[PDB]
Design an enzyme around this catalytic site. Structure first.
Site, PDB file in Angstrom:
ATOM      1  N   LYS A  25       0.927  -1.108  -0.020  1.00 44.04           N
ATOM      2  CA  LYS A  25       0.016   0.051   0.111  1.00 44.04           C
ATOM      3  C   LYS A  25       0.948   1.290   0.170  1.00 44.04           C
ATOM      4  O   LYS A  25       0.913   1.973   0.994  1.00 44.04           O
ATOM      5  CB  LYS A  25      -0.936  -0.046   1.188  1.00 44.04           C
ATOM      6  CG  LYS A  25      -2.007  -1.144   1.331  1.00 44.04           C
ATOM      7  CD  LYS A  25      -2.901  -1.340   0.245  1.00 44.04           C
ATOM      8  CE  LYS A  25      -2.723  -2.169  -0.934  1.00 44.04           C
ATOM      9  NZ  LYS A  25      -3.946  -2.369  -1.938  1.00 44.04           N
ATOM     10  N   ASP A  59      -8.296  -0.502  -4.489  1.00 44.68           N
ATOM     11  CA  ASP A  59      -6.984  -0.129  -5.033  1.00 44.68           C
ATOM     12  C   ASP A  59      -7.088   0.901  -6.162  1.00 44.68           C
ATOM     13  O   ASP A  59      -6.855   1.923  -6.500  1.00 44.68           O
ATOM     14  CB  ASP A  59      -6.013  -1.093  -5.151  1.00 44.68           C
ATOM     15  CG  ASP A  59      -4.754  -0.890  -5.452  1.00 44.68           C
ATOM     16  OD1 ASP A  59      -4.628  -0.488  -6.714  1.00 44.68           O
ATOM     17  OD2 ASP A  59      -3.952  -0.824  -4.657  1.00 44.68           O
ATOM     18  N   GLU A 105      -6.440   4.898  -5.914  1.00 44.25           N
ATOM     19  CA  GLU A 105      -5.538   5.892  -6.547  1.00 44.25           C
ATOM     20  C   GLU A 105      -5.899   7.021  -7.412  1.00 44.25           C
ATOM     21  O   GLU A 105      -5.313   7.938  -7.538  1.00 44.25           O
ATOM     22  CB  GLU A 105      -4.635   4.742  -7.496  1.00 44.25           C
ATOM     23  CG  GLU A 105      -5.209   4.265  -8.738  1.00 44.25           C
ATOM     24  CD  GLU A 105      -4.533   2.928  -8.776  1.00 44.25           C
ATOM     25  OE1 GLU A 105      -3.940   2.475  -8.137  1.00 44.25           O
ATOM     26  OE2 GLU A 105      -4.732   2.258  -9.979  1.00 44.25           O
TER      27      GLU A 105
HETATM   28  C1  LIG Z   1      -0.911   5.128  -5.409  1.00 45.76           C
HETATM   29  C2  LIG Z   1      -0.150   4.031  -6.043  1.00 45.76           C
HETATM   30  C3  LIG Z   1       1.306   3.813  -5.412  1.00 45.76           C
HETATM   31  N1  LIG Z   1      -0.689   2.549  -5.513  1.00 45.76           N
HETATM   32  O1  LIG Z   1      -0.651   2.109  -4.334  1.00 45.76           O
HETATM   33  C4  LIG Z   1      -1.120   1.726  -6.610  1.00 45.76           C
HETATM   34  O2  LIG Z   1      -2.074   0.905  -6.355  1.00 45.76           O
HETATM   35  C5  LIG Z   1      -0.428   1.961  -8.022  1.00 45.76           C
HETATM   36  O3  LIG Z   1       0.527   2.394  -8.498  1.00 45.76           O
HETATM   37  O4  LIG Z   1      -0.971   1.129  -9.082  1.00 45.76           O
HETATM   38 MG   LIG Z   2      -2.504   1.047  -4.152  1.00 47.07          MG
HETATM   39 MG   LIG Z   3      -2.908   0.395  -7.865  1.00 52.91          MG
END
Ligand SMILES: CC(C)N(O)C(=O)C(=O)O
Ligand SMILES: [Mg+2]
Ligand SMILES: [Mg+2]
Ligand SMILES: NC(=O)C1=CN([C@@H]2O[C@H](COP(=O)(O)OP(=O)(O)OC[C@H]3O[C@@H](n4cnc5c(N)ncnc54)[C@H](OP(=O)(O)O)[C@@H]3O)[C@@H](O)[C@H]2O)C=CC1
Ligand SMILES: CC(C)N(O)C(=O)C(=O)O
Ligand SMILES: [Cl-]
Ligand SMILES: [Cl-]
Ligand SMILES: [Mg+2]
Ligand SMILES: [Mg+2]
EC number: 1.1.1.86
Lengths: 513, 510
Positions: A170, A233, A237
């Protein structure tokens, strides 16, 4: 359903109670490295496929932890034919000289655990060839549940003779590596991770997943499912982590400068405020400590901003979540990956730059003369908008059914301990572009949505003298998430990430001196 | 879609060496309506949003001229607030021209489903169950086929399915028809499709419906070609893109020192006035040629820098529409207008209460009658580059020139822009469909951001002019094709003012 229990024969599972909800966790630490050989029984080679943001970080942490454990497990990097990442893999210590760098398909074929760390769109369009190269009864490990969502859209699933697990940091790749390195001075440090066991064909899946997370340096590891992970997720983001914070910062900078605030001050009152004092306070003391640090007049301004921004923020977050859950957004990311190349008589459209506009040029100048150790001003109105969006994200995830560990990492911890420090260091791109292709696309698609709704609804409400919805303020102050955030903070190591504009541990194309 | 009519005259048009078949309109063809409408005693117009009020009145007026005994009945839900509006337009329960929705579907020979696209997606089984065997379902957009496809479904096999899709907003379909009454007609061009045809009446029923609406010309398409080009176009040059361009340029111009009054005039007034007028009757090349040599250089810098970033977003939008992602997003958005899952209801909000729009109110308050705005070369270059990029995307994705030109050029200048000139972005956007309104809100920000981030940065960094791009714009075959279509255009310009009474009830002002 919302929480998930598990069993480990190797590691010690412990309970945390978040808002009356018992959740099981595994704490990290370098003192646990001697347990890795047991966690990895049956594994001689771990094949790390790719060299983007997560692979460079995961491969080095894994190799370092196994070395500390005196393990004989080989960590080998596998790359596609046309890759230009071979040189960077060697610079990091993986090479043909010691059989630790080779072709992606050859690497998959000889691996007992395959960590598929290539872009999500690439996984979507090449999974059949990956499955055909896996050893029967070996283990496929993912760091994102995106592939399950894509297979579901096709009515397909994983092979039947393979275990399928996930360890999902995370936080951004460069932070997984940097914090781990800083942790060598103490008992370890890193980024919290979620883990899942989708398929288990021999009983080793849970310990292999737990071992992998501990080897990455995760301060705490919690359980989830591939579906719960992709839903929270992909959404997160685009939400508070990248998309929404970018939109907020553009919208407020424009408002403040239109209202007479100098560019210097408008940048300090938006970006420096959010990435400095707001993040530091939320990291160790929480949102209630932040609100209590405002003056009495400051509290009124925070209230006006929060009251006006809460529902319009929720509107977009609600939309985004539903597009991720339905399959619409996953399909969009798969099609975007194909447009990176010429097809159908049309041009290629790789992602462009997002930090060459007005406020970011201003940011370069503010940073050019910024003294070291600057924590930024706690501008009340900015704090009100930001915290309102963070609370709206928590509520959406809560109403859609996610555990508190998942909610807190995706909406609070990741922003303050992993991401924001990069934007304080060198602006929006240094943060956004060090993230995945999926996240970079998501930030670009949704930041404009938050910018427009805040300008059209929230800011218009404030300028028309809308009454303050004091029930929203009261709800924020009595919200059960604050106590749970405090419980999670107790599992945080006492090492804060160290990053500056000239960092060499970020993506190659983002290095600057 | 090779069609054949037994009642109407088909004519050939050659667009860039491509022969297409069209049916010209005119009030003189109204006497043919009884023949076209074989087997129709009642047309049930379901809904009362933007298209229904216009279509119902245009149909009634044309049928009266045809001395036809066909009944036009409005069907509405439960205790719909639209009953009073329908009565104000002359439809009533007493003469059996206003009634319950389900009851109206049951007794109709031609059912025009003019309710929101998301409502069609969530209630089609109920609509289908009320259709009589061998009756005809008429749609004005292919969205429903797209949704059914996502479910692996199709229309019932005892019904005909056709479409007549006006390439222009509801209020313009009515207004232009009214203005055409004493000059043998005026209206909005429409596309038509025949998805299912039980007995052979489908083609002439569709053609009659289109002519009765006042379509200057009707061209052939399929339900799928129509939804792919339509959902895309409204998010593109028609609403989303023009809104993003205008916001993007207003910010740049004022940042560069231009007063707010001049920045609004050089963006919104310029595009919706003089630019639209020039493209409407003379074309894009003519617009370029009208520039001074310094103007042409400014146009070139803007066009060269904006073309590809614009195409980037258009390419993305088109593929999300064709894949099904966008249709699903619209269906889910409709459900969020109401409370569910313990969460609030989120109806669409206002888009014209921000800075540049409050400035617009002030600009219009002192605008003299007949004012068409300034011709600012840089603005023309950005606008025309996006227009050309949209044409190329549709071209590469397989669309006909009649469809490309209406969705990317004609509709913008003859139907939509006059509304933004009359009263700002909301008077244009919000008079369109729920699907288009959601689309404009979702995509305008995308065009604004990409133009600020890539195109405008390239201009500031002194990017060289892409000579090949400019050369191709100048020799592009679409220009002559647009000229041919313009010949089919009545010499009538839509008359719209801030106090128009033919717009949606909630947008009417005094
Ligand atoms: C914001 C980022 C680092 N995040 O946790 C992701 O899930 C990603 O890069 O896909
Ligand atoms: Mg993430
Ligand atoms: Mg991600
Ligand atoms: N970035 C982050 O911090 C986070 C990412 N994740 C997840 O980790 C996984 C990897 O993400 P990330 O590191 O960001 O990677 P990217 O999304 O940045 O993908 C770039 C990598 O994918 C490779 N790649 C692209 N196309 C192909 C192809 N056709 N075949 C083989 N390889 C290809 C590139 O190869 P090459 O080097 O040769 O060019 C490069 O190694 C994803 O599942 C992501 O969701 C999880 C947590 C956070
Ligand atoms: C822009 C608008 C009038 N258009 O033609 C549409 O298709 C619509 O409203 O859905
Ligand atoms: Cl390192
Ligand atoms: Cl009228
Ligand atoms: Mg249309
Ligand atoms: Mg439409």
């Amino acid at each position: 359903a919302t929480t998930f229990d598990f069993d480990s024969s190797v590691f010690k599972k412990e309970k945390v109670t978040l808002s009356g909800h018992d959740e099981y966790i595994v704490r990290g630490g370098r003192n646990l490295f001697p347990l890795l050989p047991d966690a990895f029984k049956g594994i001689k080679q771990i094949g790390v496929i790719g060299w983007g943001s997560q692979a460079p970080a995961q491969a080095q942490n894994l190799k370092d932890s196994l070395t500390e454990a005196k393990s004989d497990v080989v960590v080998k990097i596998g790359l596609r034919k046309g890759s230009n990442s071979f040189a960077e893999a060697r610079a990091a210590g993986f090479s043909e000289e010691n059989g630790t760098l080779g072709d992606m398909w050859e690497t998959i074929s000889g691996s007992d655990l395959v960590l598929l760390l290539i872009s999500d769109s690439a996984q979507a369009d090449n999974y059949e060839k990956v499955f055909s190269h896996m050893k029967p009864n070996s283990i496929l490990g993912l760091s994102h549940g995106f592939l399950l969502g894509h297979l579901q859209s096709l009515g397909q699933d994983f092979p039947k003779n393979i275990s399928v697990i996930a360890v999902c940091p995370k936080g951004m790749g460069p932070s997984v590596r940097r914090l781990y390195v800083q942790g060598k001075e103490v008992n370890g440090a890193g980024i919290n991770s979620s883990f899942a066991v989708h398929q288990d064909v021999d009983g080793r899946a849970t310990d292999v997943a737990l071992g992998w997370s501990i080897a990455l340096g995760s301060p705490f590891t919690f359980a989830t499912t591939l579906e719960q992970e992709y839903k929270s997720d992909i959404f997160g983001e685009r939400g508070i982590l990248l998309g929404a914070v970018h939109g907020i910062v553009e919208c407020l900078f424009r408002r403040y400068t239109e209202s007479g605030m100098s560019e210097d001050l408008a940048y300090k009152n938006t970006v420096e405020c959010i990435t400095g004092v707001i993040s530091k306070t939320i990291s160790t003391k929480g949102m209630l400590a932040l609100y209590n640090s405002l003056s009495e007049e400051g509290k009124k301004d925070f209230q006006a901003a929060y009251s006006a921004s809460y529902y319009p923020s929720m509107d977009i977050l609600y939309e985004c979540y539903e597009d991720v859950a339905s399959g619409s957004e996953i399909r969009s990311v798969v099609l975007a990956g194909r447009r990176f190349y010429e097809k159908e008589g049309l041009p290629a459209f790789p992602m462009g730059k997002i930090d060459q506009t007005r406020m970011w040029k201003v940011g370069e100048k503010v940073r050019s003369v910024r003294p070291a150790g600057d924590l930024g001003p706690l501008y009340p109105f900015t704090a009100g908008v930001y915290v309102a969006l963070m609370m709206a994200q928590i509520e959406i995830l809560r109403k859609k059914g996610h555990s508190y560990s998942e909610i807190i990492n995706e909406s609070v911890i990741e922003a303050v301990d992993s991401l924001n420090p990069f934007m304080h260091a060198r602006g929006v791109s240094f943060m956004v572009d060090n993230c995945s292709t999926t996240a970079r696309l998501g930030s670009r698609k949704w930041a404009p949505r938050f910018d427009y709704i805040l300008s059209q609804q929230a800011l218009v409400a404030v300028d028309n003298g809308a009454p303050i919805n004091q029930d929203l303020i009261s709800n924020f102050l009595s919200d059960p998430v604050h106590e749970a955030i405090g419980v999670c903070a107790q599992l945080r190591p006492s090492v804060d990430i160290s990053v500056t504009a000239d960092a060499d541990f970020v993506r190659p194309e983002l290095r600057q001196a």
